[PDB]
C-alpha cells in the first residue's frame, strides 16, 4: 500500500521541477513591506503573473509524457489550466507560515490591492479552504500537475491520452493522502474537491484584471494570450 519505486520516482521528479518555483518569501515580504497603490499592485500582479506562466510552461513540458501529446492539446491544456495554477500557487503562498499578525496583514493588503469587491470574498474563501487542508509541498506539486493534466477540459481532442498521464499522479496523490494522513481518510477526496472549486475562477478571470481599480490596464503579450485580455 506504500509508494512503489516508480511512485517515489514520479514524486521526486515532480517535486524538483515544482521547486524551480519563485521563492514565496520574495512575494510576501514585498506585500507586507509597505502598502502600495492599486496601480503599483496591478503592475506587481502583471509581472508576477507573466513570470508564473513562464515557470508553468517549464514545469508542464517536464510532466511525464506531456511532450508526447498532440501539439494543439498541449496548448489547450496549458491555456485551460494557467489561471487555476496561478490561483493554486497564490493559495499555497497565502497559507505559508508567517509571524503573528503577518497573515492577517498580507490578507488586508491583498484585500486593498485594487481587485474589485465582487472577486474578494470567493478568492479568500478558496485560500482559507486550501489552508483548512494543511496541504504539504508534495500535495501542491501533484495537485498542480493534476490541474494541468485535466482531460475534462474544453477543446481537448484526445482526452484518453491526457487521462493516461493524469492517472499515475492521481494514484501517487491518493497513496500520499493514505500513508501521510491516516487520521483523515477523506483527505484525497477533499483535495479533488478544491480542484472543482478552482475552476470557478475561470468564469470571470479577464474581468478580475479588467475591473482592477486603475485607470489603464496594460498587459504583457504573454499575459494577453493566457488571460483573455486586450
Amino acid at each position: 500500500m506504500e509508494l512503489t519505486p516508480d511512485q517515489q520516482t514520479l514524486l521526486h521528479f515532480i517535486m524538483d521541477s515544482y521547486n524551480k518555483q519563485r521563492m514565496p518569501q520574495e512575494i510576501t515580504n514585498k506585500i507586507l513591506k509597505e502598502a502600495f497603490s492599486a496601480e503599483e499592485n496591478f503592475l506587481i500582479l502583471t509581472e508576477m503573473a507573466t513570470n508564473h506562466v513562464q515557470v508553468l510552461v517549464e514545469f508542464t513540458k517536464k510532466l511525464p509524457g506531456f511532450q508526447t501529446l498532440d501539439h494543439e492539446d498541449q496548448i489547450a491544456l496549458l491555456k485551460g489550466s494557467a489561471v487555476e495554477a496561478m490561483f493554486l500557487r497564490s493559495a499555497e503562498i497565502f497559507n505559508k507560515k508567517l509571524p503573528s499578525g503577518h497573515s492577517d496583514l498580507l490578507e488586508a493588503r491583498i484585500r486593498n490591492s485594487g481587485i474589485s469587491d465582487e472577486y474578494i470574498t470567493p478568492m479568500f474563501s478558496f485560500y482559507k479552504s486550501i489552508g483548512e487542508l494543511k496541504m504539504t509541498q508534495e500535495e501542491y506539486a501533484l495537485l498542480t500537475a493534476i490541474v494541468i493534466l485535466s482531460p475534462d477540459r474544453q477543446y481537448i481532442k484526445d482526452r484518453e491520452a491526457v487521462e493516461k498521464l493524469q492517472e499515475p499522479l492521481l494514484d501517487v496523490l491518493q497513496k500520499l493522502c493514505k500513508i501521510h494522513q491516516p487520521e483523515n481518510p477523506q483527505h484525497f477526496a477533499c483535495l479533488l474537491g478544491r480542484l472543482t472549486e478552482l475552476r470557478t475562477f475561470n468564469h470571470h478571470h479577464a474581468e478580475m484584471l479588467m475591473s482592477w481599480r486603475v485607470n489603464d490596464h496594460k498587459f504583457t503579450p504573454l499575459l494577453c494570450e493566457i488571460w483573455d485580455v486586450q
Binding site: 513562464q54 510552461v57 513540458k61 501539439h71 498541449q74 496548448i75 496549458l78 491555456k79 503579450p221 504573454l222 494570450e225 493566457i226
Partner: peptide, 12 residues
C-alpha cells in the same frame, strides 16, 4: 493563435 505559448512549448 497562441503564438507565444506555442513558441515556449516548441523551443529547446
Amino acid at each position: 493563435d497562441h503564438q507565444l505559448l506555442r513558441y515556449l512549448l516548441d523551443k529547446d
